Amino acid sequence: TIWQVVFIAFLTGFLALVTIIGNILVIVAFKVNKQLKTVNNYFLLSLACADLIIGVISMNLFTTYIIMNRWALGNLACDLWLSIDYVASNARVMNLLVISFDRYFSITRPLTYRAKRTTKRAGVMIGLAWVISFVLWAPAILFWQYFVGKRTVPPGECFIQFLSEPTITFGTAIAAFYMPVTIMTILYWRIYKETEKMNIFEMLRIDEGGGSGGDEAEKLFNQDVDAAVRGILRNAKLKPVYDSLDAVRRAALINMVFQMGETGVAGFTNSLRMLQQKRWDEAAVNLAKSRWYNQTPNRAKRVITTFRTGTWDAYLIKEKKAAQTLSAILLAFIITWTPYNIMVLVNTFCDSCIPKTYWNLGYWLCYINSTVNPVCYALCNKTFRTTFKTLLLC
Ligand SMILES: C[N+]1(C)[C@@H]2C[C@@H](OC(=O)Nc3ccc(F)cc3-c3cccs3)C[C@H]1[C@@H]1O[C@@H]12
Ligand SMILES: OC[C@H]1O[C@H](O[C@H]2[C@H](O)[C@@H](O)[C@@H](O)O[C@@H]2CO)[C@H](O)[C@@H](O)[C@@H]1O
């Protein structure tokens, strides 16, 4: 009826508009901001590309197929839609796998990947994913009707030919969706556990803004930090404070003796006392007024924060921020696409058990995943929230 056509036509355009607006802003945010240009940001820019294609082409075309209750766009337009639709969405699963192995390899491979991240190398990865995804689906969808000779697709209907068999589709959804989902789940929970770990060596690494130097180099770092402890114990002016501190706040003390020496730190007589009196906020205010805070306010602010809170917050906030962002991107991907794939599994053991409508809903729901990503960006990352605001108004 007229009600069903206008109702459908509204929310598809409403969702299509949100998608196009959001993904078009994030792409501008990367070009309009010199502070958003990171390796991680480059990847997310790739998703917006595939996501923007979905919001522009796939939503309007497929929305016409379901509205008119039949496909009338022509035969060659059908092979382009399905191919582009499947090549783009497949690149999305590729980008997510790369984003996962980026953080994972960034958190597990400080030797090579941590120090091998180049915005030029990134382009190679995105290049692989897009070219690979194109090859897997474009030729198969376009030319399959030629290898078999005839076309199984009735006129006025548009669907992938070689996917007509349900058993063949089940194996395809396994490799295309389930397996990538399984891997990304494995990498996440490992990255998640990594976000809670921190010691004095990584504390000094971060403060120094440096990196590893192999085995021989890492053994020397251990000697120097070990000797730093002895100096504190041999020093009669520091050992009292050190012995009355917790494992975290002790690392903060070693962080100072490492930067200024035993005698230099022993000069903080008042501050070294308030620490032994566990008057954290009072000692923090005192250390803030020293020259040491004016000569290295970044390193001091973190070490001082450690004394106040007694936690690794100043040395882990960056890692957690990314972890939360990745959790959102994954969760959106899992929530929206799972229905459709669960139908593929069900339909494999059922001659006909899914109505034509349930399939069309899962198909459009998968599209919605391309609508939520820009929202997740602005919700978690603060830089996107401000950059998006200055684009609409300013
Ligand atoms: C546009 N989509 C709505 C996207 C999401 C849905 O695909 C899925 O969830 N998995 C699949 C199930 C069977 C199959 F043979 C291939 C797929 C996939 C193709 C690319 C990534 S998985 C259905 C279509 C498809 O292009 C994707
Ligand atoms: O700047 C030299 C440094 O000597 C001590 O600190 C570290 C030093 O940075 C390491 O290279 C290695 O030598 O171990 C030393 C500590 O045992 C002082 O503690 C430090 O103040 C001084 O700057």
Author numbering: 63 to 259, 1001 to 1118, 482 to 560
Q: What text appears in the publication on this structure?
A:
An example are drugs targeting the muscarinic acetylcholine receptor (MR) family, which comprises five subtypes. Thus, the antagonist atropine is delivered directly to the eye, while the chronic obstructive pulmonary disease (COPD) drug tiotropium, which reduces bronchoconstriction via the M3 muscarinic acetylcholine receptor (M3R), is delivered by inhalation. The development of selective antagonists for muscarinic acetylcholine receptors is challenging due to high homology in orthosteric binding sites among subtypes. Starting from a single amino acid difference in the orthosteric pockets in M2 muscarinic acetylcholine receptor (M2R) and M3R, we developed an M3R-selective antagonist using molecular docking and structure-based design.
The single differentiating interaction is that in M2R, the B ring interacts with Phe181ECL2, while in M3R, the residue at the same position is Leu225ECL2. Third, the docking suggested that a small electronegative substituent would be tolerated at the para position of the B ring, further increasing repulsive interactions with the Phe181ECL2 of M2R, while still fitting well with the Leu225ECL2 of M3R. Chemical modifications, including the synthesis of quinuclidine- and scopine-based quaternary ammonium salts and the bioisosteric exchange of the terminal benzene by a thiophene ring, led ultimately to the antagonist 6o (BS46), with M3R Ki values in the low picomolar range. To test the model upon which these molecules were based and to provide a template for future design, the structure of the M3R/6o (BS46) complex was determined by X-ray crystallography. An M3R-mT4L fusion protein was expressed and purified in the presence of 6o (BS46), and crystals were grown in lipid cubic phase. We obtained a 3.1 Å dataset from 93 crystals and solved the structure by molecular replacement. The electron density for 6o (BS46) was unambiguous in a Fo-Fc–simulated annealing omit map. Compound 6o (BS46) binds to M3R in the predicted orientation, making all interactions predicted in the model, with the fluorine oriented toward Leu225ECL; overall, the crystallographic result superimposes on the docking prediction with an rmsd of 0.377 Å. When superimposed on the M3R/6o (BS46) complex, the fluorine would sterically clash with Phe181ECL2 of M2R. The selectivity over M2R is enabled by an L225→Phe substitution in the orthosteric site, while in the other three muscarinic subtypes, M1R, M4R, and M5R, Leu225 is conserved, and so the compounds show no selectivity against these receptors.
